[PDB]
Symmetry: C3
Subunit: 154 residues, 3 copies
């Protein structure tokens, strides 16, 4: 029955699921920008992937952590950077979910700030015994590329 | 009584309302950037409006879809663009609601990214039998214009 | 018992807490950009603080309001500005909470838009009888400074 105890519990769980998924996505940028490679990698399942058009795919937590520990990212941190992910649209289906959002990498160059990359992202998630975790993130530049538009599309 | 079943149901409904409204707003940019004109227009009620200072107002779903199908927007998509809407403040009052947020249109020009427009937005919504839908969106540039500040104000 | 009435009430309260805290943060930028100094200051407890590296700390609501009423901020509003705060990560612990987010100040200069400041923020909150309120906000530029990275870190 609508508004009975079992119904409220199901509806609350759905809100909790969505809020957990949004929290994962909102933690990415702070963790990246502070260099917390291990914790960032732990947003994903152990064999999670992070794919970017024109890059080698990072497969598994060690590889994802190695992106944050890597030269290029560390140099970006030394310049000054923000990995700014916007509000996500989220769809939950049982024990899986999908989100889409934009991301901008802001970079400080010569004492002024600019937009180093502007991208689309599509994320997938699954419910694990320890909570929701990312399964795959795909990212592409919104530079006219076809892939970026496809990542956003429903 | 606080925390009784009826009270929990009312409080849960309010959270659901706010999350639905935030989800509408978060879907706008992905739908715009992927060119999904029909679905974007369906964020609004049938006779919904989208007003921008110094532009003709788009009235009705066909007119709102025609903005995304239009030359100017399609050219922006070919350049590479992100319609980046920030987190919204939301106020629900019964079966209506209001939200305010910022939006930035990022555009790729000559292989680098910039901020093509930076704007205020005020959105109104109503509860329909099929869920929350937008009624009116108003937008103005944060270029010193009076209208943009008024859109944000409480 | 999981999913009993008392358990649902506790879980709902936690969602409400997080949504209230997110709403405080989402109101900051609209209030700043519209010049609503009083209401902006009332996001904080009476003796709340707003600290920015290399600035005098604003202590108390009058001082926080005086930032928005101040010359520098008013000139920024006349140029055209957006105080764009991204999605926050939020952790609630009882009657206190912490959030981290990015902020970008967009500014219109000579009819085009740019990123005037890009910053890290760490916010603390407490539950008051009138709802959640900010206690301290700290902000630093993501220009390579150590403080900005520390604000983001978990």
């Amino acid at each position: 029955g609508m508004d009975d105890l079992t119904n409220l519990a199901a509806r609350l769980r759905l809100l909790e699921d969505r809020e957990e998924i949004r929290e994962l996505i909102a933690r990415y940028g702070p963790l990246a920008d502070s260099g917390d490679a291990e914790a960032l990698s732990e947003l994903w399942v152990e064999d999670g992937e992070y794919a970017v058009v024109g890059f080698a795919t990072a497969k598994g937590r060690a590889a994802i952590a190695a992106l944050i520990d890597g030269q290029t990212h560390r140099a970006l941190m030394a310049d000054g950077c923000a990995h700014f992910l916007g509000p996500a649209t989220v769809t939950v289906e049982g024990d899986t979910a999908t989100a889409r959002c934009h991301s901008v990498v802001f970079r400080c160059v010569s004492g002024t700030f600019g937009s180093h990359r502007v991208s689309a992202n599509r994320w997938t998630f699954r419910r694990t015994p320890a909570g929701w975790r990312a399964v795959r993130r795909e990212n592409a530049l919104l530079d006219g590329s076809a892939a970026a538009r496809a990542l956003l599309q429903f």
